[PDB]
Amino acid sequence: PVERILEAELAVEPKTETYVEANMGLNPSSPNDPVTNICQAADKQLFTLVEWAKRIPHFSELPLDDQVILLRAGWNELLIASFSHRSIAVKDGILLATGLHVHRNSAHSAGVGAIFDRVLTELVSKMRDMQMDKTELGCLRAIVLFNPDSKGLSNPAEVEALREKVYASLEAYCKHKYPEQPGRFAKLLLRLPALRSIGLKCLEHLFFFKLIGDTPIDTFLMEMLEAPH
Amino acid sequence: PVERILEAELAVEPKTETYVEANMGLNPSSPNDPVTNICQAADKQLFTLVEWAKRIPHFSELPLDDQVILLRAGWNELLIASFSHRSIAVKDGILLATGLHVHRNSAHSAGVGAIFDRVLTELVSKMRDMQMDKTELGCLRAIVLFNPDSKGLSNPAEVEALREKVYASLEAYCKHKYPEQPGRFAKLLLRLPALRSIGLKCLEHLFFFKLIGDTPIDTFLMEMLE
Amino acid sequence: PVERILEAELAVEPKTETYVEANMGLNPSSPNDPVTNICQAADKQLFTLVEWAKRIPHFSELPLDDQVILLRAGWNELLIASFSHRSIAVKDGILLATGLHVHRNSAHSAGVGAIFDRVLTELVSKMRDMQMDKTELGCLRAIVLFNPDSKGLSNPAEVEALREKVYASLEAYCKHKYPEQPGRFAKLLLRLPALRSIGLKCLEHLFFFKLIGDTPIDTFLMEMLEAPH
Amino acid sequence: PVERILEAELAVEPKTETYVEANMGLNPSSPNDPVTNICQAADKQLFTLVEWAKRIPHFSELPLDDQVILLRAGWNELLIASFSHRSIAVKDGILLATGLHVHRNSAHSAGVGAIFDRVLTELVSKMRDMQMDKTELGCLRAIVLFNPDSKGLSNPAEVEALREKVYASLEAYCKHKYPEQPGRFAKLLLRLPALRSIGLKCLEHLFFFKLIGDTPIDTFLMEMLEAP
Ligand SMILES: CC1=C(/C=C/C(C)=C/C=C/C(C)=C/C(=O)O)C(C)(C)CCC1
Ligand SMILES: CC1=C(/C=C/C(C)=C/C=C/C(C)=C/C(=O)O)C(C)(C)CCC1
């Protein structure tokens, strides 16, 4: 069921109450301790990522250790793929939670303007222009999850076979929804290299962290220093 | 025409008169200076990459400054794709163009065995098991050359168009040559993510430089220190 | 001087009971939730570093903005120096503040084996070979803390003067305590280059996150994966 | 003996002509070719480095394998240390062997400005303010050369022993040459961590390669496919 993929994708997508609420500030968590925020949002993100994977057919039938291995190897790219696709809605930017979100400047003043340019140019814009739908996105993420190159896999050949079945379905799906675009399938697959190197840069540069800034760092450190000697 | 790409592949390949010349040696030059000998080796492989690119249909039709951009953006992966495939003939190392064979334990030379094993497992090992031919290898490198994401391109849309004509022909080729492998075309394309990340790791470990420079440098060092 | 710095090393770090809790039960909180758990663990460790810094003579008399700068510049080296010295007792892996022994094989399984081995050979064994004592360790860390090369300092010269006071006192201590080892003082300082490069490699490898986050994450993963759909 | 080392640094102490030929252009090599230019050097630098090391007492006495491993473990820091001291005579710039001056502007333009500025503020400026002399520089370099943490050497102990002889000598030097400044020995030694991190960053960020500029890349690259 190429739907059980799209379904898993749609069953994890952020609502419109976290887009709204956070946009104006109608959410709780009172922005006062931004040491919690990143942590809480991180745990929620991780939780939802695991739920999404368990819904991917055959994933849970994989060995325990291998499931952990695949998640540790793809979580980064799986997250980048999602927010890039959600960013199709914003004008020249990335979407996280609060009223549209981070623009180039914020990224620029954060020192990561160059990788921000890469995300918009290689992912967001490309997804928007060929109008990647949520079913194709779900399939690409599943292909990412079923990464046969992951180190430690008890049986990489099994992971590769599940990957084959996933993209075999994506090809049929494309062949049915866009007969006019015979090269759509390949085009989809040809976004994975960009996802790979962008994923590596965001990792090595801690993209998202630097976006937040270093003032909260100085703030919490200051709080420790004003701790009662 | 996937055959015009297949031809560009063979032409730029050694004539076994160079292969012998190293995996069997034959340097009618005798190594002497190190850093200079290394650059000459680099200049050599670099020029052969440019020769190859010129023989790729339409490449030379793109604006000159864009050709340079695509070259500076893909040289790294293009060379890795070349020796990873050529290394299918051997059992446990990477076979360089200059015929030189660099084993694993000997290559790792307590310095780059990590990415070295990645080349064997993610690229070399996979290419051998599926037995991709020079035509498929050629099309994959052509796809890599025609990278529409290359920063600074004046017309990404035209590079993308050229890229599409290539994998469309690659797909037709695969479905005609290997009738009973419907997922072969996709499997070929799915090695690009690996090539992309290995490409990056080879840059931060000067994999190349060391691969073609530690011997000339160690030789130099031994005479100097004698 | 030497005595106040030694007192700083001894104060925050031990109680035969602390090294207890995390290495045979007799511990609370039970690992369950991911990110927030590790963030609290990190917060605690960093605080111990701040309390220590505040006990080093003159550090507190510097502008608050400079204390923050020095802490941001040296925290990673200050911590590695601490656990590296604590590990001279064993010949396998490293001992954490909680006295728990992280074995060599755990570092290699986590993909940080090469850097872990550097800590072992360049710091742990070297400290063991010369039997570096706690006074000398504290002085080296104080020197690392007063790093005049830190960017943004309002007055690097004052930080440099605080550094020289520390190493002038360290040298007197060594020559008085170990008169038969004339090159001891230099040998102590010559471990700083190693601490520097190891410090940088630990950052690029996310050494610290893996040290406190790898286990709680896999536990969370393995539990949710086999749990009821 | 380090004036045999200071004589080792003087046996190559960038003469005079070499500086006027480059700090003007009265040098052959017709600055027409690039690859050839940057290459004649680094080969010349490597040669001068190896000859410098052979003159360091006891080095040539180590097993051959240990010698090459020490040289390849330290060449980067050895080179950075040398042009840093030589640049004391210049402001916000660096001087290479031939009198080739590289200003920080070129570094910030190529994307390696922060590392270039670390060389200026952590090495050059420090060396200048304390007036580090060539003998002290030669000893710091000998210490870096005898790096006992170097991987794969047959006897780390023997290397650290040679390292101790060097710094014991450096301390003696400082005490008698500068009796009025007791912290000088330590100060010299405390420039080593900075040299360590700078060397690593220079390698990580392809320092030298980026200083060449991108134009000479597009140059002969445009040449290769613009043949005649
Ligand atoms: C542009 C370039 C370099 C290129 C090296 C190459 C291209 C090496 C080896 C290729 C092999 C071994 C290819 C194959 O056999 O297919 C080096 C690092 C010297 C540094 C200067 C920039
Ligand atoms: C600053 C910082 C972190 C710090 C971790 C520390 C400082 C942990 C533990 C050290 C140990 C294990 C020391 C010892 O036992 O000696 C982590 C990675 C969470 C991520 C956020 C940034």
DSSP per position, B35-80: HHHHHHHHHHHHHHHHHHHHTSTTGGGS-HHHHHHHHHHHHHHHHH
Strand partners, A94: A102
Backbone angles phi, psi at B205, to 5 degrees: -130, 15
Cα A208 to Cα A104, A110, A214, C191, D86: the distances in Å are 13, 10, 12, 35, 42
Residue C101, strand partner residues: C95
Residue A102 is classified by DSSP as: B
In angstroms, the first-to-last Cα distance of chain A is: 62
Collapsing DSSP to helix, strand or coil, B102 comes out as strand
Distances (CA, A) of D39 to A169, A180, B33, D221, D223: 54, 55, 10, 18, 19
Name the H helices within A55-191.
64-86, 104-109, 113-118, 125-129, 134-145, 156-177, 184-189
From chain A, pick out residues whose CB is under 8 angstroms from the CB of B143: 190
CA atoms of D114 and D104, how far apart (whole Å): 9
Residues composing chain C: 229
Query: For ligand 2, is residue C79 a contact (CB within 6 Å)?
Result: yes
Exposure on the CB side of residue B3, measured as CA atoms within 13 A: 1
| d(C-alpha D143, C-alpha D186), whole Å | 14
Distance, in Å, from the CA atom of B215 to the CA atom of B37, rounded to the nearest integer, reads: 11
The structure tokens 């670099």 sit at B46
Q: Is the CB of C82 under 6 A from ligand 2?
A: yes
d(CA D47, CA B221): 9
List the beta bridge partners of residue C102. C94
CA pair distance D94, D88, nearest whole angstrom: 8
Secondary structure string (H, E, C) spanning chain D: CCCCCCCCCCCCCCCCHHHHHHCCCCCCCCCCCCHHHHHHHHHHHHHHHHHHHHHCCCHHHCCHHHHHHHHHHHHHHHHHHHHHHHHHHCCCEEECCCCCEEEHHHHHHCCCHHHHHHHHHHHHHHHHHCCCCHHHHHHHHHHHHCCCCCCCCCCHHHHHHHHHHHHHHHHHHHHHHCCCCCCHHHHHHCCHHHHHHHHHHHHHCCHHHHHCCCHHHHHHHHHHCCCC
Which of A136-159 are b and which e, b meaning 16 or more Cβ less than 10 Å from the residue's Cβ?
bbbbbbbbbbbbbbbeebeebebb
Domain D1-228: give its CATH architecture. Answer: Orthogonal Bundle (1.10)
Q: In 3-state terms, what secondary structure has residue C94?
A: strand
Residue C96's φ and ψ, nearest 5 degrees, are -85, 170
Taking the CA of residue B189 and the nearest CA in chain A, the distance in Å comes to: 7
Phi, psi dihedral angles at C3 (to 5 degrees): -65, -40
Instruction: Spell B41-79 as b/e; 16+ CB within 10 A means b.
Output: beeebbebbbebbebbeebeebeeebbbbbbbbbbbbbb
First vs last C-alpha separation in chain B: 56
Cβ-count burial D158-181 (b if 16+ within 10 Å, e if not): bbbebbbebbebbbebbeeebeee
CA dihedral C24→C29→C34→C35, nearest 10 degrees, is -120
Q: Which ligand is closest to the CA of C46, given by its number?
A: 2
- Minimum-distance ligand 2 atom for the alpha carbon of C213: 19
Pairwise CA distance, residues A144 & A80, whole Å: 11
Q: Which of C139, C8, C145, C166 is nearest to C71 (CA)?
A: C145
**DSSP reduced 3-state for B91:** coil
Round to whole Å and give the CA distance between A168 and A151. 24
Is residue A174 a contact partner of residue A226, using CB atoms and an 8 Å limit?
Answer: no
* Helix %, strand %, coil % of chain B (to 5): 65, 0, 30
DSSP reduced 3-state for B101: strand
Closest by alpha carbon to A187, among B174, B22, B146, C12? B146
- State which CATH number among 1.25.40.10, 3.40.50.10490, 1.10.565.10, 3.40.50.720 fits the domain covering A1-229: 1.10.565.10
Q: Are B167 and B189 in contact (CB under 8 A)?
A: yes
Q: Whose CA is nearest to atom 4 of ligand 2?
A: C42
Cα of first residue to Cα of last residue in chain C, in angstroms, is: 61
Q: What resolution in Å is listed for this PDB structure?
A: 2.0
CB contacts < 8 A (C, D): 57
Closest CA of chain B from D60, distance in Å: 7
Of the options 3.40.50.720, 3.20.20.70, 1.20.1540.10, 1.10.565.10, the CATH number for the domain spanning B1-226: 1.10.565.10
**C-beta atoms surrounding B170 within 10 Å:** 24
State the burial class of residue D87 (Cβ atoms within 10 Å of its Cβ: 0-12, 13-18, 19+).
buried
Q: Say how many Å lie between the first and final Cα of chain D, rounded.
A: 58
Q: What is the rounded CA–CA span in Å between residue B165 and residue B145?
A: 13
